[PDB]
Each structure stands twice: as C-alpha cells, then as structure tokens.
Amino acid sequence: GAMNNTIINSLIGDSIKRSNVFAVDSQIPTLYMPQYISLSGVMTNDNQAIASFEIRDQYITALNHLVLSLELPEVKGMGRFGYVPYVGYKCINHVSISSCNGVIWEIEGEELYNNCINNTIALKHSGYSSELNDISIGLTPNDTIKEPSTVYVYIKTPFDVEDTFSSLKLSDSKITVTVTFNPVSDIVIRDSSFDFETFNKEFVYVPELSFIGYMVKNVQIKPSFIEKPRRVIGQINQPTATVTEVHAATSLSVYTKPYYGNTDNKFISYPGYSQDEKDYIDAYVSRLLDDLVIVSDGPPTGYPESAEIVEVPEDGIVSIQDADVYVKIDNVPDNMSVYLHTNLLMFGTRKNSFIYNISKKFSAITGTYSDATKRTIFAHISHSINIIDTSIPVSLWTSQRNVYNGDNRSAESKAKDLFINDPFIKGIDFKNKTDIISRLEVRFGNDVLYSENGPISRIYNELLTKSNNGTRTLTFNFTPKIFFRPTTITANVSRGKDKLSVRVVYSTMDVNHPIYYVQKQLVVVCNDLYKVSYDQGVSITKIM
Amino acid sequence: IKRSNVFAVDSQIPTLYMPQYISLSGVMTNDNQAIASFEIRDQYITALNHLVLSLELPEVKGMGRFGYVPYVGYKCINHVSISSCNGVIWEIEGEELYNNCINNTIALKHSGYSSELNDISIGLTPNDTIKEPSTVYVYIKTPFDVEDTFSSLKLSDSKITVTVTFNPVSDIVIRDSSFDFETFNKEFVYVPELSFIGYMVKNVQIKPSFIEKPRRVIGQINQPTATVTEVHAATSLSVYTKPYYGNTDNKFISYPGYSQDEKDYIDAYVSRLLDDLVIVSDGPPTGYPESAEIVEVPEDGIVSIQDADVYVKIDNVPDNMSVYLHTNLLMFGTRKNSFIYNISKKFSAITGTYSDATKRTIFAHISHSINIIDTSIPVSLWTSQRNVYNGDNRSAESKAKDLFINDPFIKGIDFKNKTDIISRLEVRFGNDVLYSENGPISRIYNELLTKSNNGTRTLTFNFTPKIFFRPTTITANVSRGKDKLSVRVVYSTMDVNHPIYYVQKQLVVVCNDLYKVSYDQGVSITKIM
Amino acid sequence: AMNNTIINSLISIKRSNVFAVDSQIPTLYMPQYISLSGVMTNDNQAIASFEIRDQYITALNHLVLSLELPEVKGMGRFGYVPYVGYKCINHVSISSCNGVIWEIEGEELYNNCINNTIALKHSGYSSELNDISIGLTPNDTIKEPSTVYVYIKTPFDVEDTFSSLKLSDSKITVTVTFNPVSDIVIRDSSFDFETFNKEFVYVPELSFIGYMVKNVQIKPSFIEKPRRVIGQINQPTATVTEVHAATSLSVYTKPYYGNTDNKFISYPGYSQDEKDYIDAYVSRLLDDLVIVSDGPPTGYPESAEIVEVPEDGIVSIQDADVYVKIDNVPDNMSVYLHTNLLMFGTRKNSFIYNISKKFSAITGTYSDATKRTIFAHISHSINIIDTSIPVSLWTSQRNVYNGDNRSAESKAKDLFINDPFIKGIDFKNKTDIISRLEVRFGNDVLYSENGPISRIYNELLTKSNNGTRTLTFNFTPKIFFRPTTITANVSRGKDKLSVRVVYSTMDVNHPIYYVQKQLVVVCNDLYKVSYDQGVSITKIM
C-alpha cells in the first residue's frame, strides 16, 4: 500500500524491554490559575526617582515575568530631540525584589539590559521605533517634537527560567519591587536649541508594574537556588578591577565602558533609529560634507581663520600633505568655483609633528550642483571614516592637548551637535566594535584561574547563549538550571582564594588621535550563588 | 553525598518503528467551494504527524497587473479537518492555522514568499507570461507535532480523512482592472497534494492523550462584543480585530509587492501619488477633475495649503514649462466647514530633476508624514457618501493603476497591523469579570512568552508543559452560569474627518477548548466538561 | 489582587509538583576553556594536529578552531569567501589510541552549522573580510589582519555535559586538514597570488570546554558518524556501501569547474542576496553596454556590434527591443549600445544566448565632470544563473561566436572564485536541477519523489532556510535514547543505499549547460561509544 514493502518486511517478522516513544502518561499538575496583575506604584525623590510596588495578597501564591510600563509624555517646543534606542531599559538604574527578611534578588540597570540584549521582542517593547529614536525637530514653541507613547520593560528575573517551577513563591509575605530611575538626561538625545532645563523639571517617570500571578491550591514549596549579579567598576583608565568575597560564583563577565566626564557629552552626528555601523558612519559623513565641499562665488565665508579652504584645480585632485582628494561636482555655475575644506577637524600634540585630519580621511567626492535649491547633491563618496570617528566627543577636538584650533566647521554645523548621555555605552565606540582588550588575565587569589590573548571567552559566550552581542564571560555552571544545584567556583579563604582579580592589557593608541583621551572603565560582573529559604517568609542565604 | 550523573546517561531502547514521508493525491469537490479530501488507510501506517499541503500554482498568461498575496499557500486555506469514522479529531480555520505559524519563518517562506510570486507583474500581450508556474508548501501545524513521535496521531486500524476547504482565488490574488479576472477565476483550479510523516510501529502501546481544539467566534460588523458559548475547559483565549471591506470595491491606490516592511508600504504609496502631486507642464495641467486645485509653484518654492507649507524645487525644467503642485490630491471632509484630511498637506518637501530625454520628473528626496494607515485606505472611502468633497482628485491614469486586495488574513485597520484600535478589553466568565485591561499588556505577554513580533491580546491559562501533563484549564461552573466567555472591547476614538474612521471592524475571539483523545474502538475525541 | 471569579473557582487525585522541584546535587566538576597550539604538517596539504592529554581533563565538548588571517598587502583586487573559517576546513578527525572516534568532511561540518547564524558570523562574515578590496601601491594594505572562529559542531555538544566526550586516561588527537588558500580567496589577475600562496600559512588554535570531573561514572553512548560519497562527474547515480544502521541520508548536487579557469565576470562581495549577485553583474556589464562617445566607440573587439541609439530611443536586437535614453549628452557625442556584449551559440545561424537582449530599458545622465555615464534605472531579465556562468564558457570551443565582446578594462576586473562549498549550478543554489529522486535499500525501493518534499521536511524539521533532500529515520530524542535506524539484511542483499536522480536538462545554446554537476550522497551511520580500556567506537550491524 502506502508504506514501502522493504520497510514492512524489515519490521514484521520483541524480547527486549522498550521505552514508549509513541505515548506518555498525562501527569495531573498542581491545581493553579494564572492572572496578569498590574500595579501602580509610589514615587519618591540626589533626588533620584524611585518607584515602590507592594505585592501582598493571600491568593497570589507565586509570581514571575515582571514587565514595567513607562508613559512617555508629549514633547513640545523648539530644537532637536529624540530618545535613546531601547529607552525603557536605559531608564532603569536599579531593580530590587525584597521581602520582610530583606533583598531576595537585585540587578543594576545595565546588567538587566545585558541579560535581555538577545531578546529582540523585549528590546522592541522597551522602545525601538523611528517615532521614538529618530531625532525630531521642533520649529515653533508649541510644535510637537514627540507624540506621547507607552514603553514596556521586561524585567527578566531567575524566576522566569523554568516558568511555574522557577516562580517566586509568596509564603503569606509582602514582596516589594523597587525601581530606581536614571536621570532623564541619560535617555534623551538633544541639541543646544532644545530647552532641556524646562524638560528636566517637567518630566516625571510614570511607571506601572505588571507580573504573572499564580493562585495555587495546596502549594508544596521546596527550597531553590538563585544567581545574583554583582558588578565592580574599576577606576578611570585603570586596567584592573577586583571582586571581593567570591565564595560560590556561577559566572564572571568582563567588559569596558567609556567615561565622558572630561567632555560636555556633545557629538557631531547621530544616525537616529538606524543603528548599524554603516548608519553611524553615513550620518557622520553627511554632517561633514556640508562644510567639506563648498560651491561658492569666490573664497567661502563663515568659517574660522584657522580653516584652510582650497579651490579644487582643473585635474580635480587637492593634495593635503601625502593625502590626495578627488573632487568633481557637475552643473557648477560659471561665476562659482568648487572648494575643499582641507582641515575640517584636526588634532596634534606638538606644533610641527604628526597631524590627524578628518579631511585626509576622504579620497573622492562626486556630486551635482542644484540651481533650484542652490545646494550640492553628493552622488558617491570614497572615504576611510570609521565607527571611532563618529564616537569622538566634540570637546576632545577643541581640548587643551590640541595645539591646533581643532573644530574648523561652520557655526551652522556646530549648532547641529547633539548631547548623548546613554548610560549603557560599551568599549570606546557607539557600536562597541573596537576590542581594546589585547589580553585578559583572571586571578583567583595569587594563582591564574584563566588567561586569553583573543576574545575566545566572548566567542563561547556568544555561541552558548545564541547572542550576537556577548561579553568575555567565564561560565562555571554547565549544569541544567532550576532542576540542579548550580556548579560554582569554590573559594579557599585560608589560601587567600576569596577574590577575583581581573587584569587587562589595553591597546596602545596614537596620542595625535582624539580617541586616545576617551577615559576607560573596566566592568567586572560576578554572579553569586544564593539559597532561597521559605521557612517563616522568603529569604536568601549566600553560599559560602 | 549522593549525586545525579550529569556526565552520562542510560541509552533507553525506544519503541521499534520506521518513518516514511507519504504523499497523497486528493479528491476535488465543488456556493461551489473547492474541497480536497485525502483518505489515509493502511494497516502499517500506525501513526502520523507533520502535515504539509503542496499546491501547483498555474502559469498566469494575459494582460494587466497580477501578483499573489504574501504566504499565498496559507491564504488559500479556509478550513482544515482531520476526522475518523467516529467524527472530527481536530480542525482549524485558515486564519488560525496561519496565526499558529506566523512566528515560523521557514513555514511562511515555503508557503510562497518570493519576488517571483508576490511582486506585481505586468502582462503586455494576451499571450505574455505574467507568472511562471510554481509549487508552494503549506505546513499544517497540528498538536500531533508538539512532541514529535510522543504527540503523533495514532491510527487504531481506522480511516483518517484530511479535508481541506479552499478560499476563492480572489482572496489570494492582487490585480488591476486591466487583468481578465473573470476568465482567470473560471480557468483556475486548486491542485493539492497532502504529505505527512507516517510511522510503522512494531507492537505499539497506545495510551490516551489530550488535545487543544481552536474555536473562533466572529462578532457582527462594528459590534464591540463577541461570546464563546459552552466554555467548560479552556487553555487560552485570544482577542483581535479584523477589518471588513464589504462597503468597498476592495481597491487600493498602492501595493509594495514582495517588500513587506512598513517603510516599503509607505514608499510605494508616495511613489504612486508623486506622478500627480508634482507636475511639470506647459501651462496649467490637464487631465484632472474640475474639483482639483493645481497651483503653480512660486519663485521661493513654497506653496501654502492652509497652515501646511510645501517646498517644491525641480531642476532642469524647460523655459516653456512651469512646476505645479496638486494641493488636494486626496481630501476628506464630513461637513463643509469642519476639519479636512488632505493628503497633499502630508508633504513638506519635494525635490527632483526633469529629464529632457524621457520627458519625466525624476524625484530625488521627499520629506513627508505619510503613515501605514494612509496606504491602507480603500479608494471607495475617499469617494464615500460621508465626504462633502469629490475625494479622489488623481488622474484617470493613476486611478487605472489601483489594485484589488482581498487578503483574508488582514488584522486591525492597516496592512501591517501597526495601529492598536482596542482602547479597553473586558473578558467575562459567565457574568463575573475574569480579566480587564486599559493597555495591551496581554498582547505584550503573548509576544514575549511566544517570542513573536505579531501577537494578539491573549489570556493564557495553561503554563504547564504540553503532552507530558494534562493542560491547566479554566474550570467552569454551570450552576453559577460560568459556562461562557464574553468579550467586550472599547475601540480607540478617531476624528470623524479621517477616512480610516469608516473602516468596518469585526471582533474575533479564539478559544482553545480541551478535549481527551480516546483510542478504544478507533480514534475519538471527548470535550472536557 | 486576584479576581473573585478565580478565587471562587478554586477555593484526592495525585498531582505532580509544577511549582517546586528538588534541586538534585550534580556530579562534582569544574569547567575550563582550554586553547591549544597545534603542529603543522605539509597536493602538499596543510594538516594541524592537536593532542589532548591531561589528568584534570576528564571530558570535553564545544570545539572552536581559531585562525589568524594575515595582513594582505600589495596590488590588485582581493577578498575572502563568506564564512571563510568553515571554507578553510577540508576534514576534521577526533581520534584516540584505539582509532577514529568521530570525523567530518569540511562541507558537512558547514552544512551542520548553516542554520547557526552566530557560528557563521564568527567564522568570518563582514564587509571588512568579504567585500572585494583594491590595492593601489605594492605596499598598500588590502586586508587588515583578523582572527576567525570556526565552531566544530560535534555530537558531544547535543546535550552539553551529558553528551561530552569522556577521556578514560586516553590521548585524544584532533586533526584538521586544510583546503588550499585558493579556495577561500576571491582575487583578480592583477593580484600577486603566486607570492601570496607561497607566503600564506594557516595559523590554527583549538579551543574546547574541558571538564575536570571528581569521581566520574562513565556509561556507554551512541554517536552518528557522517559518510560522504561523491558520484562520477555528471553521473545521476551514487551508492553508499555497507549501510547497516543509518539515522539519515542526504542528497544534493554540486558544480564542477575543472573545465574552466574559475574566473567570473562579477561578485557582490559581503552582500550575499540573489538581488545583490544580479545587481553586481548588471553594474559590471553597464560599463560596456551603454557608451557615450564622439563617433563609433573604440577599444572593443572587431566581433562587437556597437549600434548608435536612434532619436526614437529604441534599438532592435532581433525580436528584443532596448530603450536607451541618457541625459546631458554633449553635442559632439552620441549614445551607443553594445548589441552583443556576451553571446553564445553552437551553430552559425541558429538560436543565440545574447546578454544584451536580456535588457529592455537603460536610463541615466552623462557627467561632464567625471566624463562617465551615471545610470538611474535599469529594466532587465538578468538571473542568478547569468552571474554564475564562468568566463571560460563564453569563450569555449562549443561557441561559434567570439563570445566575450567586453572591453579589455572590464575583462581585467574578472575574479577567480574557488569556493569549495557551492551547491547546484548557481551561486545562490536557487535552480533545483533534480527532477526526480529514487533511493534503494539494496535492490528494493526505499523512497521516491517527483518534488523536493524531502528537502521541505528537512528545512521544516531543522528550522533551516538552506536544507537538502534528506531522509531522516531517527525521530527519537538524541542522547537519552538509542537512535532509530534502517535495519540491514546482509543475506537478502539489503546492506547498501543506491541513489538515482533524474536531472532536468538545460538548453544546449545556454552557457550553463556546460557547467559540470556532481551528485553528493551523505549517510549518517550509527556507532556505539565504548570506554572499556580507552575510548573506542563500534559500527552497529
């Protein structure tokens, strides 16, 4: 019939005991009923915004999947304004889940975001749209820059790992969820024209905590284990950080963070919603091109005396030292000539030494002059502009270290600069592309626990977690979560093996390049093992 | 201390079986709805799962614009029924099968998602090939696939009949007026083939199982209520809206083809409007209705349509010709002195260059505020009775390029289902409120828990693992009248002078009822009560 | 707060605890990421040997091969193939003192990782590596040095610690055989490949997750070992002998470019979509297709038929009409179309495969500043096959015409592509050239299909967009169960799998007809892992 005769004869024609692979006994589970519960908080104000949510109900036996709502207000007025990508996560400074017995679980804003970086849905929900993240311009004092919106922040906790099995049980105890918010300055990208002073005064965080509550008939509570993260931020430009009292750790993550305290946090360009490396680069090239190639009737005006604008010769090639720039613009009027800004942005430590000129990073600029709009429409640009260039704060171009003026752009271009205060920036560039760690050494006391010359620990992290944006992580727990006691790195207090000392070898950069002056901070995250006890309320105990 | 072996495991000998991919040709039957019946009866086919329906799409020859809807294979399905001699074992509505597969990129690609199928192709001669023949594969996801061999549909020497009801070819096709649909609808025939993974099991040990059967109730047009009766044991409840285009001719100004992003829909619309929006002509433009207000662009480039300023600057315009802006391309107004929804006002800057060689304007950059809703407005609503103005002030050429879209699985009020029109949801078990929300938090949980970007407002009752456990259901009380689920929605208030306000809405409520699979004297299902 | 309707609904039968679980103490162990430098050995194939023997290392899994790609300096066009790290691999073999435990062919390891986006990205998929870079001076940097990571997916990773390869105080040798650097590199004639091939050396490093296990309790396990059979060139048959217990059988086709110089007109670089391949081809052809010149164009062969575009704009190449209209053309110059850019035919007065006929409309604007044509919109019928035709076939002895009527400038821009993992007859493996598939277990027919339904099931069951015609026999969960296999009957002759395909035939006047095909049949055989006196495998028969 339908089955092939070769198969029928292979089977039809018994002694050995076999496991039933075609049927299973449908086990009756614990009688329960779930419900999505949303709660309004209590706002408190260094005058940091803190939201407190109290969960106390006889029928809320267990809970998991915490989602924080945030009502973003209508933004009216003049100037350029936009929210940072995944705005909802960037709002969060700290989250604490505590009971009468103390803190059960807590996370720093950046660590919660890092744990959700692989979750596209959670990231989209937190605020990733052209409506929120593109930089909008307000023309009149009553013009709407941003329409009001609601964002949803998934607060991933260890209670979600195995759904109902991992859920936080409530032993007739009061659970308080505390959310500490970062200043609105962090989540906003704006220009000088925008009235931030008024905005910061008028802005208020409007949060609402949602969770999946479970009403369990005759609950049989058993003790569980929980991994609690603990971060350590090293001193400015120090290649070392130490995590004290490490007794039972499931993982250790190492990454870098830039420090922009020495700057005004202003940047030349921002790509808006489009977040690819190419998008960041293109946004920068587009901003520079306005001043880089000028079609004018006589030498261009409105630029500093320090600026050296050169007329493009008949051959099209302009020679800036060793660098040759080919500039050819079509439909240029007979009364006008093509000009090139040979030193748009320049840096140097000594008056007659090596110079880093952004105009030298261009090799070919082709376009057509529009008689109707009286502007140059660029066709193709050949350049060597990188993600680092786009990530250089404006302050460093005009820094005291620089012997030259630095910023030779027009006043128009300078006015379009945007303040970026994103709290979750990693590495030294906006895309965290440049790996500035040449070598990583992890020491458990005096002994060397781990060492690497390549980011193989990041490769394993990215592979094992199926993430495209991982960190140099040392996982100690390869045992299945919830159903087993996690495997940890056991300490030896007597031998001085109760600390994790991380040492890195930062890459050596050129002093005549502005990124050299971007202050660095080594972030070391340690996940400590704790035991959840439900005897006379919920409580946690550090495994030692 | 006693420790569990985490580095080694005893390799259990499984049930002796042999799988085989079996493909069957059906029996076609013809309201003259196309129905395909597939009979599965073999002593050696002990169990089956992973149903895949193949469809041989024919060569499309002739004149006019033609293209298939994205995921054409899923859109073909109106209903699927898996039945035995004891009756229906499992059944699903076309849209619900598609909804269950929306997160499966592979299944969606297989069903027909290509530039070859979905881009709108134009036929120039009556014998010109518009679309080349193709075969699409529709994965009919069933609860028998959840845990592979463990969840498989067992055949107790019983006849299993797979019945596939097909939607009319009108639903899966996007065409213009020039296309001879009358002939196509007559000539078109569904050519199906059902494939499945069959298992020959030596000494099968069948045990009873549980199955979730989806039930849907579609509310009346513009009625914000729907009720699912005889709810005794439900595992979930999904709530969504569907647009109803009966009050229209199902014609739309633009369609982006294969490129399905929100931006792609918007760009396709802007491109279609631009042909009539900015005109380079020798004297005032002709071929437009008297109702049209085409204004010559002044020297400064700014044309003022009320409070809205439109900057229009076209290069290489001949000395004998002038640049013109259509100030009321598409307009809507309920009353003569009320708010006006003007599509030309949705543009702020239009720059381009006139080509002397092709005698046409090549647009460079467009600054506009056009949205996904604009692209989703049926042409009929612009020329609606409620509109005191003419409405459609486009050229006869532009109007002839309009496409009929009859996609049966459209949700919300826009083509991308972006706009959430439910302001408040209220679910009642019997008479008592089971759940209520002011925000789409149930949709957020659905999208998060299922790792889907296109979820619905879903109330999940079962958070217990499937197949290995009896699903956690909402327990009913007949005596208290708690034997039904009533859904009441409050729609988001829109301004009356916007054309989309007149899109008829339909509330869809899906209930997953729990059934017990019994294998005593053939396969049979029993509703848990 | 909980709703009153829920509280009233809840407030004898045995129930499984779904809200709590006993946290079982696992086997005491400690993991460590261990990286090892190899031993390089050298038609004169590069082989890297990695020896794993340590008292602490009890078990291992997740093999990752690191490769140090050197700085590429000099003149000419150069770029690496996408997923360069996987393409480097010819063979991988994990062996003990008792012999080979597990081994895979380079292409099969890549096929097993094609659904893993992360593993593919790590192996080298960037604009920095895969876009074709041009070197202007002999000391100009074409490619900056980079490190690529190749995830060698093994059956020991399936269930993490449970599936891990245990080392019974035995020496485990990981042997990696490398394909020639010619395979992983896309370059032009201007590039000094001769020097590069001499100077290039594979710099590998094997990383793995080692486990130090206190009081390990080793139990025997099962392993699926792949076997590949490549049929004779263009032959629609291949047989895999000694098939006693197989879990699956995959069937696919590969092109053979031995009859060519492996040179191709265009390559899209990093952008790998079908449209990207097509656009890169159109862009390369357009330079010679539409010429703006002062009088008839020069620098083309005598065989070229360059026609001046009439006032009408339409140029008629036989039945095919090409509309060409270029703006801002100088008064002294005219618009010209190359009516036979690439042509193929087997007879002097028969059907022609002309590439110029594959164009219907070409619009653009002439730039006075750069003295070149800037194309705006192109209407064409160019396909993935056209882009996949090797240059040799256009100039082949089968062709009555000259074939390649492009300029010397265009011909110099041709790139050598030697990617070892190309499937089908096109670069995107779009064209399905198998009309029918027949699989025989011994002399009896096991499976037959007229459509690629086995490929559809493979793509669906593995959640992959790039699958093959696969016959899976094991639908039982891995590691926790003995896999389900086709059972042989040596006495009845049923101890081999014979695959017979029916290839759809191409048009003899179309250059792709002369692209050689190869049938590839992959069989996964079941083996038992024994740990008694070292690690050893035994074929299930």
Ligand SMILES: CO[C@H]1/C=C/O[C@@]2(C)Oc3c(C)c(O)c4c(O)c(c(/C=N/N5CCN(C6CCCC6)CC5)c(O)c4c3C2=O)NC(=O)/C(C)=C\C=C\[C@H](C)[C@H](O)[C@@H](C)[C@@H](O)[C@@H](C)[C@H](OC(C)=O)[C@@H]1C
């Ligand atoms: C993290 O989850 C684990 C929980 C551990 O803790 C502990 C104590 O809690 C558990 C649950 C809460 C379970 O619900 C559970 C199962 O439902 C289950 C098995 C199955 N395991 N074995 C056990 C021995 N038997 C038998 C013994 C003698 C002859 C054969 C065979 C099956 C199991 O052990 C379970 C289990 C535990 O062991 N499924 C079956 O019974 C079955 C009908 C088929 C199984 C098919 C696959 C093989 C299996 O799905 C595989 C893909 C894995 O995914 C799981 C094993 C999973 O492990 C990992 C790792 O993934 C565990 C559920």
